[PDB]
Design a protein around this ligand. Structure first.
Ligand SMILES: CC(C)(CO)[C@@H](O)C(=O)[O-]
Length: 304
């Protein structure tokens, strides 16, 4: 009898997180939907690499699958940059609808020519600013903060627009950098801040919600293409189910997160005027309009 094929998938976050739910659900569904013919071993906390290294590894084929935020993706697939524009998405429902519908479907196609099968869009969440130095109540309070960023050119340009001094770093370095005070802060969804225990190394958090962070199930293209057609469908369907449970965990994290982090001693600013943060980014946003075009930005904004 043919040997079960085993593949590996990893993330940079904890098993007990929104992304751990994503990959564990995916793995369970692949095994079920392929009648046990495929099995997926799951790795966490940047085992097998943090996100950029892992996306590269999947492209090379050194392991088969990864689940990553959109953060490091533009280096590989430039077309996703528009998703990383600050304040583009009104809320999670808007973002999820865009990604699941034809706009997001078109973006999945852009991975094919770069050596991936992008199985499905999933979610990291809306990102929020934390730091060790001071409470952030207005955009001016961000000026001069030394902040870690992802390896993403849109985020870096945007945050420089707030006067932040940016340091791109792989996620596997971040807890220690915060602890050592190399940087004052970072930015991430509540799902990450909670699961990574950043309350232990960050006194301040503001719910700026300044960008939406999608995530992706990625597979090596050559490997995906060699699967029998029915198993290709099983992998896609498993990824979509992983996205569903992932998003549900994000919802739970976002609902409980302010109370959870306050109880852990963080000062959490959840009353800001977001419109002032948008206004502060006007010059950078004018650049993004020139870069992406009004047509593409309005196409996303129009979405229901
Ligand atoms: C935590 C993370 C790896 C999750 O995708 C990402 O948001 C990041 O690098 O900050």
């Amino acid at each position: 009898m043919a040997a079960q094929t085993t593949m590996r998938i990893n993330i940079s976050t904890a098993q007990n997180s929104h992304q751990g739910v994503a990959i564990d659900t995916f793995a369970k569904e692949v095994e079920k939907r392929t009648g046990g013919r495929y099995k997926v071993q799951t790795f966490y906390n940047a085992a097998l690499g943090a996100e950029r290294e892992s996306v590269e590894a999947v492209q090379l084929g050194t392991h088969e699958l990864t689940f990553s935020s959109s953060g490091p993706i533009p280096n590989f697939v430039p077309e996703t940059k528009i998703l990383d524009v600050p304040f583009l998405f009104r809320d999670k429902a808007h973002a999820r609808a865009v990604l699941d519908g034809p706009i997001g479907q078109e973006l999945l196609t852009r991975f094919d020519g770069k050596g991936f099968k992008a199985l499905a869009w999933a979610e990291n969440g809306f990102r929020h600013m934390s730091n060790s130095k001071r409470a952030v109540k207005e955009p001016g309070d961000l000026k001069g903060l030394k902040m870690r960023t992802m390896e993403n050119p849109v985020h870096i340009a945007a945050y420089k627009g707030f006067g932040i001094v940016t340091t791109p770093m792989a996620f596997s370095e971040v807890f220690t950098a915060l602890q050592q005070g190399t940087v004052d802060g970072q930015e991430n969804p509540l799902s990450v801040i909670i699961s990574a225990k950043f309350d232990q190394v960050q006194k301040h958090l503001t719910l700026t919600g300044h960008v939406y962070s999608p995530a992706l199930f990625l597979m090596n293209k050559a490997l995906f293409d060699k699967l029998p057609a029915a198993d290709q469908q099983a992998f896609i369907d498993a990824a979509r189910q992983g996205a569903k449970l992932n998003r549900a965990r994000v919802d739970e994290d976002d609902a409980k997160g302010v109370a959870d982090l306050r109880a852990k001693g963080m000062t959490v600013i959840d009353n800001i005027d977001k419109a002032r943060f948008v206004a502060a980014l006007a010059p950078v946003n004018a650049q993004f309009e020139k870069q992406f075009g009004k047509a593409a930005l309005e196409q996303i904004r129009s979405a229901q």
